[PDB]
Amino acid sequence: YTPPEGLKKLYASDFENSKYPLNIVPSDSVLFAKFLYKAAEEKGNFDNILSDFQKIAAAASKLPIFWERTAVVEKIPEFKQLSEPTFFTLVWMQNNGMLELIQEVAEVYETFVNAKQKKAVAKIFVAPGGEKNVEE
């Protein structure tokens, strides 16, 4: 793997102590999500990461059961189309063997993005198939 210089420089910094839109308690996923937010903030684009997660979720639906334990992101073609920050993070997880946290790091990243963009998300819990009417 040949990570870009920008990600290499950031990955050696104490970015964990930097300022973020929200003060989330440190966690295994949160460190991964903070890194993505910091990398995306430099470029100023955050929707690219969200698209990458969408592709990952779609790709995972076709991968064999327990793919996160035999995972090789480099060999997987679906992840070849991901952005450098996301691909670097996936390799970083695969090195820590925490590729099962993909669906939770994304949630944190979305929370940071919404806070930065000043968006408040309301969760509407509805019965299966009852989502047709949400006017109330």
């Binding site: 793997y1 990955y11 295994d28 991964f32 390799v91 820590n96 925490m98």
Partner: protein, 46 residues
């Protein structure tokens, strides 16, 4: 004297075992609750 000596030698053996198990059950708990954090190193450089 032969019946109280056995209970005395049997008691010291149990006393030693119970203590060491008890210490080594509070060492497992400390180790188990603790875990290694995300490994921040140049994984690519390998």
């Amino acid at each position: 004297q032969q019946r109280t000596s056995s209970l005395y030698n049997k008691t010291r053996q149990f006393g030693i075992t119970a203590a060491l198990i008890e210490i080594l059950s509070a060492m497992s708990s400390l180790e188990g609750n603790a875990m290694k954090g995300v490994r921040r190193n140049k994984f690519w450089e390998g």
